[PDB]
Design an enzyme around this catalytic site. Structure first.
Site, mmCIF file in Angstrom:
data_model
loop_
_atom_site.group_PDB
_atom_site.id
_atom_site.type_symbol
_atom_site.label_atom_id
_atom_site.label_comp_id
_atom_site.label_asym_id
_atom_site.label_seq_id
_atom_site.Cartn_x
_atom_site.Cartn_y
_atom_site.Cartn_z
ATOM 1 N N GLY A 211 5.377 -7.119 5.175
ATOM 2 C CA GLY A 211 5.488 -8.493 4.737
ATOM 3 C C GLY A 211 5.154 -8.687 3.276
ATOM 4 N N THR A 212 3.961 -8.252 2.863
ATOM 5 C CA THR A 212 3.560 -8.440 1.474
ATOM 6 C C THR A 212 4.447 -7.644 0.527
ATOM 7 O OG1 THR A 212 1.680 -8.402 -0.049
ATOM 8 C CG2 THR A 212 1.827 -6.611 1.557
ATOM 9 N N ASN B 298 4.595 11.670 -0.240
ATOM 10 C CA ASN B 298 4.411 11.077 -1.557
ATOM 11 C C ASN B 298 4.620 12.103 -2.663
ATOM 12 O OD1 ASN B 298 1.764 9.359 0.056
ATOM 13 N ND2 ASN B 298 3.759 8.480 -0.460
ATOM 14 N N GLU C 50 -4.067 -7.059 -0.239
ATOM 15 C CA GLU C 50 -5.118 -6.444 0.555
ATOM 16 C C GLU C 50 -5.960 -5.553 -0.341
ATOM 17 O OE1 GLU C 50 -6.233 -3.509 2.045
ATOM 18 O OE2 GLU C 50 -7.506 -4.586 3.472
ATOM 19 N N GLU D 149 22.260 5.346 -18.798
ATOM 20 C CA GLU D 149 23.388 6.169 -18.375
ATOM 21 C C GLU D 149 23.285 6.540 -16.902
ATOM 22 O OE1 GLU D 149 25.935 7.412 -21.796
ATOM 23 O OE2 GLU D 149 25.922 6.149 -20.006
ATOM 24 N N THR E 299 6.888 2.213 12.857
ATOM 25 C CA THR E 299 5.473 1.883 12.942
ATOM 26 C C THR E 299 5.223 0.451 13.383
ATOM 27 O OG1 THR E 299 4.958 3.487 11.206
ATOM 28 C CG2 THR E 299 3.319 1.793 11.696
ATOM 29 N N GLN F 7 0.824 -1.206 0.000
ATOM 30 C CA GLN F 7 0.000 0.000 0.000
ATOM 31 C C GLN F 7 0.859 1.257 0.000
ATOM 32 O OE1 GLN F 7 0.277 -2.101 2.385
ATOM 33 N NE2 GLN F 7 0.272 -1.184 4.428
ATOM 34 N N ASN G 178 11.781 7.736 5.867
ATOM 35 C CA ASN G 178 10.785 8.804 5.910
ATOM 36 C C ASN G 178 11.135 9.932 6.875
ATOM 37 O OD1 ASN G 178 10.295 7.426 8.359
ATOM 38 N ND2 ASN G 178 8.716 6.182 7.362
ATOM 39 N N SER H 165 7.468 -0.381 -0.036
ATOM 40 C CA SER H 165 7.973 -0.180 1.313
ATOM 41 C C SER H 165 8.609 -1.476 1.798
ATOM 42 C CB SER H 165 6.851 0.255 2.252
ATOM 43 O OG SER H 165 6.067 -0.851 2.655
HETATM 44 N N1 LIG Z 1 6.705 7.156 2.780
HETATM 45 C C1 LIG Z 1 5.687 6.313 2.909
HETATM 46 N N2 LIG Z 1 5.818 5.192 3.703
HETATM 47 C C2 LIG Z 1 4.786 4.327 3.842
HETATM 48 C C3 LIG Z 1 3.594 4.564 3.185
HETATM 49 N N3 LIG Z 1 2.745 3.568 3.492
HETATM 50 C C4 LIG Z 1 3.370 2.703 4.315
HETATM 51 N N4 LIG Z 1 4.633 3.163 4.551
HETATM 52 C C5 LIG Z 1 5.641 2.499 5.390
HETATM 53 O O1 LIG Z 1 5.538 1.099 5.229
HETATM 54 C C6 LIG Z 1 5.726 0.443 6.463
HETATM 55 C C7 LIG Z 1 4.926 -0.851 6.508
HETATM 56 O O2 LIG Z 1 4.709 -1.318 5.198
HETATM 57 P P1 LIG Z 1 3.360 -0.888 4.443
HETATM 58 O O3 LIG Z 1 3.669 -0.219 3.131
HETATM 59 O O4 LIG Z 1 2.552 0.009 5.352
HETATM 60 O O5 LIG Z 1 2.528 -2.242 4.197
HETATM 61 P P2 LIG Z 1 3.160 -3.424 3.314
HETATM 62 O O6 LIG Z 1 4.608 -3.123 3.034
HETATM 63 O O7 LIG Z 1 2.413 -3.608 2.023
HETATM 64 O O8 LIG Z 1 2.973 -4.739 4.213
HETATM 65 P P3 LIG Z 1 1.521 -5.074 4.816
HETATM 66 O O9 LIG Z 1 1.303 -4.175 6.005
HETATM 67 O O10 LIG Z 1 1.458 -6.519 5.244
HETATM 68 O O11 LIG Z 1 0.452 -4.791 3.795
HETATM 69 C C8 LIG Z 1 5.274 1.429 7.521
HETATM 70 O O12 LIG Z 1 6.147 1.389 8.623
HETATM 71 C C9 LIG Z 1 5.370 2.783 6.856
HETATM 72 O O13 LIG Z 1 6.447 3.501 7.403
HETATM 73 C C10 LIG Z 1 3.454 5.685 2.386
HETATM 74 O O14 LIG Z 1 2.392 5.900 1.812
HETATM 75 N N5 LIG Z 1 4.502 6.564 2.252
HETATM 76 MG MG LIG Z 2 -1.179 -3.731 3.795
#
Ligand SMILES: Nc1nc2c(ncn2[C@@H]2O[C@H](COP(=O)(O)OP(=O)(O)OP(=O)(O)O)[C@@H](O)[C@H]2O)c(=O)[nH]1
Ligand SMILES: [Mg+2]
Ligand SMILES: Nc1nc2c(ncn2[C@@H]2O[C@H](COP(=O)(O)OP(=O)(O)O)[C@@H](O)[C@H]2O)c(=O)[nH]1
Ligand SMILES: Nc1nc2c(ncn2[C@@H]2O[C@H](COP(=O)(O)OP(=O)(O)O)[C@@H](O)[C@H]2O)c(=O)[nH]1
Lengths: 53, 432, 430, 132, 430
Positions: free
Chosen positions: B137-138, B221, B64, B247, B172, B11, B199, B133
């Site tokens: 996990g995913t 973003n 998800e 390049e 987080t 996400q 971040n 990110s």
């Molecule tokens: N800069 C930024 N970081 C994000 C964003 N969304 C999630 N994160 C970071 O991603 C970390 C966790 O991974 P997520 O992207 O939220 O979720 P995921 O990587 O798909 O894994 P799942 O939670 O199982 O779905 C969090 O600690 C956030 O710091 C975003 O929109 N912008």
């Molecule tokens: Mg998720």
């Protein structure tokens, strides 16, 4: 009625902090876009030699 | 004729790709329905449908449904292709083994099918951009599996990873070091170029320069999208000295293992206090190198510089660039590696930056985006290794991973690989 | 007649040619539509040197644009004077070389070069009796430095008796834009020294110095640099296309500037060059033309001419003047600076006079000098090369497309030997 | 993880919802802005309709609603190409690179200001040949 | 003007014809009142092919509606576009068949077929030059499978030279609707190999899986299946009704697709098919059309065509396009799939082009194929027939009208011979 708390016109919700300036609107409103200058290009570039005069 | 394919997973990747796609569409003048109101630069990102609109070259993956469905119901409902928004049913829930061994194996085939059906249309494929990110996990699992599949399916095509590693203290989740280190092991031998986007640095920049004390995810973003546009604009906009995706790795990668770079952008000032100053080329290129403006929370003063590639966009002039670079070389606080007399690559483009209505960023002529490979990056790896070691000493949370089919001994291999990587960095950093 | 063809590759070479052809067309009174609109009869007197005729009486330059990436021609076709070039002659790849000498010389260049070689062969057999080839390229770029020199080798192996001309833009460390100049530069110049009949070097930093100091304009541009380099291009051959007291061709310069077969690297210069505001204070005379032509700061190269001794020099005057003033002042300048001229070659300066001056000017001078001062460029380039190579940095990408470190060792050894041989004669005494 | 049969009316996120939302016969296709897309209550006091996508009513013959299709749908090659030699123009689609239409073709005014701008401007051809 | 007359019997045939006439009237711009309101003049030159002209300027289809029960025609007349058919072309009994082939082919069919023969003969000499007959019917039912096939026999006896094509809806083993399919299915399939010049098989199960997988519509009905079949059959005779670059009629298709007189069973397919979500998001090009038309899952028959080898194929492109791309697409698909085509016959794909695409599109493809994988349906039907026959279930109902098991045995024997003789070419090597 809560706008004037000295905490709203500062640190707003994900927005610009209200540093209330007043720009000159006669200019500066249509398409002005910052910068130092137009990096003024030197008058005459390619005819300094072969002066054509 | 020149094109690049964009992949979004997790996400976080989806939400940053959203920001990228408002910016590109507004830059090219395409309304959300995909029609153009009234040369063919868009061919880099979009493809003509035959009559009328344009479709982006992007794919979204997630296990998800909420974020993908919000995309499908948002203001950009009429843009994206309906059957390239691949969504699963049950989330991986920060478990790397879940996203890499049981659930992602079922969706990787559909993703590969869509990638092929997109690549066959393309003819001059420049490469791949991937957004994910790392601490999820995913995200980690699908990024690893997709990268491993692509490296054998397509071979030598360039791949660029825009990864968001965890902040030093701000966090987080509570187990993200585990999946971060595993995914780092997976992508070390699979990614040509990986960039750092922790971040907390962006929070600091927004607090100081933009002067917003309570930033939301949209602003971060937006900044990332601006950086992506700065990197890519050379392919679709004419310039006095153009640079392609190919390049980058030819000039940024001294050794096959060392391919993690950190980026900075300038100028970042709101319209409120930018009209009062001039923002000349020398001062913007100084602020670009200024340590606190790096969007990676690493101190460049703690290590040597290896290679710097900078893109200027706007009305910059090569004489001004050389005058600035001479001063940067003269400055004493920044020192380069011994065996690189010259380490700079410079690109110049004409089309000045675009601004999104209602945004925080400001509209100038001159902008600079800098990507640096430096030896100082070992600090983040060391600290993540320490956080991993403290947890793994007593086998905390191990059952959640071992019961998902992932073998117990795999963590030791990743630990050894991280030790080897930091050894390689400290071995390279010494002078001759 | 004694006709010469133009071919070019790499973006730098294409930019150079896009303005050199502009200069030639302006001198000969040819519009961008290819129809002559001049006033004098001598304008068409030797249009054959560079132009071909088509049905309907239109003129087409015989230039071949060739590279791996189509963007630069996509730009130049929309540019001014882009309509002259024959649309068939454009040859471009679809991949690009990525500034990698291996990719520009072995894997993509060898594959692509068949078509460009065929069109070169066609253009070569087209002319009545070929004089030679002349090239514009930059040694810092992958596709240029590799593919151009490979094409030079292929042309030389078939035309062993013709003349070879190269204008090489070498990378100076002061203005660096890429990280990998030394590798491809030394690789290109290795093959260039064995095959090129003549090569003269240009420097971007030197051109910036010229534009800042002499013309005194605040905002120089690549267009300005290309234009002055193109004026230098024209001045060499203007004598071949126009009548004069002493006609001197490329073979004239070849026999009179090269004492030994491996010493064919030159530095050039143009006079006069004056600022816009001061152009009326100067009173155009052969004496000031000479004093400016021999000014060290006026050279188009980073080499400092008073750091060494001149092996030989040559001057091409354009305009109407007496020969007595020219040759007497040549003797004067040779006498007054006898320390900077090697002693075992008496009277080592060429003079040639052409009766047609360039456009808008009454007198002009083009200077070409072979001296020992150019060793510094190779010294600094080799220093950068060995600094990068001692740690094997950026090396595996060159190795992964068929080369090995043995080639680089041979190249550096050959170039160090070249430098030693070039400085040998500087201390030679009679 | 397999497709479910119809269980709930189209308006929820159960499997296979997007297609029947796109279908125009259903009353679900056409939603309201204040439904979601809402910062706060007091902002707006009247609805507006936004519609769900742009899809024709019949699954087949779906290229309808394009005005060009009706126009060019009853033309054949013979009438297309053999019109009349007086007012016929070439319709073939050549290579893109050959039709670049350079700058001077784009704007002609530059062309006739040029020439007397920089061609035939102050050439001085003096030759000292004793006969001439 | 090489007209064809239309005949339909049974519920399935009546429904298919009702949808087909709606489609044709929509294509030709005909109101439900039979008044022409088209735009272009190309809709009137060949309007006589399918429509006869009546008083007042109106048009009437030359179709025959035939059945043993009145409810079917009571429904079709009340349905939309029911005013096109003249009341005289309706013909029905009062007793019904009840899925009993004997009742519809021996007792009631024999006594009723006099009137339908009279009306079809009247329509046959109505036209100037008859081109052929097209029938739409189902084999799994009683009245259609019996009376229609007996009428086929009679019409083939009366007109040996004309060409007859049939659109047969066979029972699919998966979607089982009646318990006595195999009996009358075999009885019917026997009586087609001697008369029908062309037979095209259609499966309800295949239609359902098409709608569920490609169209992705949640609640399909019989109307959409009828619409698919109507479009597919209408695409067959486009070239006969509209001008094009390569005209092709039914006789051309028969000669071009029939290697031997007993191999006249075909599987058909239509392109492009896409869901409602992706209507605007994909491009219509000849490569995409030819890629979709050869998809195994796109066929209108339950048989899997990748389990056998094609003998002949035919494609009828509609719209305006370039012929080189079409021909190169067939050549490419023939070279890349040499394993799926019989080798002792070269160039076994036919191309035809018509310049008028269907209403609401810009290009369309109708594909007709003769392949050896069609026999799987016959094998399954044979298995069901033998298993149900070894116990003589339901047999007395047939034997109650003078029907004997000797001809049941003959029918199954001849159908097995069909399967064997048709599959022995799958492995035939020259
Ligand atoms: N800069 C930024 N970081 C994000 C964003 N969304 C999630 N994160 C970071 O991603 C970390 C966790 O991974 P997520 O992207 O939220 O979720 P995921 O990587 O798909 O894994 P799942 O939670 O199982 O779905 C969090 O600690 C956030 O710091 C975003 O929109 N912008
Ligand atoms: Mg998720
Ligand atoms: N004279 C001139 N030189 C240029 C111009 N543009 C770039 N260059 C030179 O070209 C060099 C880079 O060469 P490169 O582009 O890598 O060569 P390529 O790989 O063959 O395209 C730089 O050092 C510049 O000095 C121009 O417009 N004029
Ligand atoms: N595609 C399609 N199939 C139909 C339709 N009506 C009936 N059928 C098929 O026909 C079979 C029954 O045929 P039936 O009505 O008994 O034939 P009849 O006895 O000759 O009238 C069923 O298995 C249905 O699948 C229709 O409108 N469309």
């Amino acid at each position: 009625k809560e706008a004037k708390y000295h905490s709203r016109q500062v640190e707003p919700l994900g927005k610009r902090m209200e540093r209330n300036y007043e720009f000159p609107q006669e200019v500066h409103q249509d398409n002005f876009k910052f910068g130092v200058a137009t990096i003024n290009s030197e008058n005459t570039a390619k005819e300094v030699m072969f002066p054509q005069k | 004729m020149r094109e690049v394919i964009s992949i979004h997973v997790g996400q976080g990747g989806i939400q940053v790709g959203n920001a990228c796609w408002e910016l590109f569409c507004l830059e090219h003048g395409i309304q959300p329905d995909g029609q153009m109101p009234s040369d063919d630069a868009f061919n880099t990102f979009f493809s003509e449908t035959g009559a009328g609109k344009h479709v982006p070259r992007a794919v979204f993956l997630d296990l998800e449904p909420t974020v993908i469905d919000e995309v499908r119901t948002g203001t950009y409902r009429q843009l994206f292709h309906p059957e390239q928004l691949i969504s699963g049913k049950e989330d991986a829930a920060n478990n790397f083994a879940r996203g890499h061994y049981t659930i992602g194996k079922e969706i990787v085939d559909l993703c590969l099918d869509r990638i092929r059906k997109l690549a066959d249309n393309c003819t001059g494929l420049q490469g791949f951009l991937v957004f994910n990110s790392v601490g999820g996990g995913t995200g980690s699992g699908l990024g690893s599996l997709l990268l491993e599949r692509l490296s054998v399916d397509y071979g030598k095509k360039s791949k660029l990873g825009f990864t968001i590693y965890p902040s030093p203290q701000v966090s987080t989740a509570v187990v993200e070091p585990y999946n971060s280190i595993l995914s780092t092991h997976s992508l070390l031998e699979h990614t040509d170029v990986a960039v750092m986007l922790d971040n907390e640095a962006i929070y600091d920049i927004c607090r100081r320069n933009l002067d917003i004390e309570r930033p939301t995810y949209t602003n971060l973003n937006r900044l990332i999208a601006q950086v992506i546009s700065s990197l890519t604009a050379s392919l679709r906009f004419d310039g006095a000295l153009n640079v392609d995706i190919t390049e980058f790795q030819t000039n940024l990668v001294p050794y096959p293992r060392i391919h993690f770079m950190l980026s900075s952008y300038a100028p970042i000032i709101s319209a409120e206090k930018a009209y009062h100053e001039q923002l000349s080329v020398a001062e913007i290129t100084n602020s670009a190198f200024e340590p606190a403006n790096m969007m990676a929370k690493c101190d460049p003063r703690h290590g040597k510089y290896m290679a710097c590639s900078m893109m200027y966009r706007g009305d910059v002039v090569p004489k001004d660039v050389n005058a600035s670079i001479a001063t940067i070389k003269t400055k004493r606080t920044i020192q380069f590696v011994d065996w690189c007399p010259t380490g700079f690559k410079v690109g110049i483009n004409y089309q000045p930056p675009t601004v999104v209505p209602g945004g925080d960023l400001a509209k100038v002529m001159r902008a600079v985006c800098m990507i640096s490979n430096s030896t100082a990056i070992a600090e983040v790896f060391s600290r993540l290794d320490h956080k991993f070691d403290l947890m793994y000493a007593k086998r905390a949370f191990v059952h959640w991973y071992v019961g998902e089919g992932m073998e117990e001994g795999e963590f030791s291999e990743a630990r050894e690989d991280l030790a080897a990587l930091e050894k390689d960095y400290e071995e390279v950093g010494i002078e001759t | 007649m004694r006709e010469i063809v133009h071919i070019q590759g790499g973006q730098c070479g294409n930019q150079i040619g896009a303005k050199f052809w502009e200069v030639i067309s302006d001198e000969h009174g040819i519009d961008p539509t290819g129809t002559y609109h001049g006033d004098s009869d001598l304008q068409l007197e030797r249009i054959n040197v560079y132009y071909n005729e088509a049905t309907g009486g239109r003129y087409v330059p015989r230039a071949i644009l060739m590279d791996l990436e189509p963007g630069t021609m996509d730009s130049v076709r929309a540019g001014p004077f882009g309509q002259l070039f024959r649309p068939d002659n454009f040859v471009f790849g679809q991949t690009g070389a990525g500034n990698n000498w291996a990719k520009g010389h072995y894997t993509e260049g060898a594959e692509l070069i068949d078509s460009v070689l065929d069109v070169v062969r066609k253009e070569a057999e087209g002319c009545d009796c070929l004089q030679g080839f002349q090239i514009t390229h930059s040694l810092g770029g992958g596709t240029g430095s590799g593919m151009g020199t490979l094409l030079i080798s292929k042309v030389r192996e078939e035309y062993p008796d013709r003349i070879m001309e190269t204008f090489s833009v070498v990378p100076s460390p002061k203005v660096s834009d890429t990280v990998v100049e030394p590798y491809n530069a030394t690789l290109s110049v290795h093959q260039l020294v064995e095959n090129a009949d003549e090569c003269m070097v240009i420097d971007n930093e030197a051109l910036y110095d010229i534009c800042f100091r002499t013309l005194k304009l605040t905002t120089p541009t690549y267009g300005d640099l290309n234009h002055l380099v193109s004026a230098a291009m024209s001045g060499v051959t203007c004598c071949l296309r126009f009548p004069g007291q002493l006609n001197s061709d490329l073979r004239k310069l070849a026999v009179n500037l090269i004492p030994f077969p491996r010493l064919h690297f030159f530095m050039i210069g143009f006079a006069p060059l004056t600022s816009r505001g001061s152009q009326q204070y100067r009173a155009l005379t052969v004496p000031e033309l000479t004093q400016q032509m021999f000014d060290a700061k006026n050279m188009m190269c980073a080499a400092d001419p008073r750091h060494g001794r001149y092996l030989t020099a040559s001057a091409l005057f354009r305009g109407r003047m007496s020969t007595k003033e020219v040759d007497e002042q040549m003797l004067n300048v040779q006498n007054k600076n006898s320390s900077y001229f090697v002693e075992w070659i008496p009277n080592n300066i060429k003079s040639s006079i052409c009766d047609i001056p360039p456009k808008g000017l009454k007198m002009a001078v083009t200077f070409v000098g072979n001296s020992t001062a150019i060793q510094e460029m190779f010294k600094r380039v080799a220093e950068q090369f060995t600094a990068m190579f001692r740690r094997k940095a950026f090396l595996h990408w060159y190795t992964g497309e068929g080369m090995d470190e043995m080639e680089f060792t041979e190249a550096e050894s050959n170039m160090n030997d070249l430098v030693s041989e070039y400085q040998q004669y500087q201390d030679a005494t009679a | 993880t397999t497709e479910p049969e119809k269980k709930f009316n189209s308006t929820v996120l159960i499997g296979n919802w997007y297609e029947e939302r796109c279908d125009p016969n259903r009353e679900q296709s056409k939603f309201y802005n204040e439904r979601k897309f809402a910062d706060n209550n007091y902002q707006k006091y009247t609805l507006s309709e936004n519609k769900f996508q742009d899809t024709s009513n019949s699954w087949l013959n779906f290229q309808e609603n394009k005005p060009e299709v009706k126009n060019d749908q009853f033309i054949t090659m013979n009438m297309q190409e053999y019109k009349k030699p007086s007012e016929q123009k070439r319709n073939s689609e050549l290579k893109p690179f050959i039709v670049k239409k350079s700058h001077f073709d784009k704007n002609p005014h530059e062309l006739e200001e040029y020439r007397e701008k920089w061609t035939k401007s102050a050439h001085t051809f003096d030759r000292m040949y004793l006969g001439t």
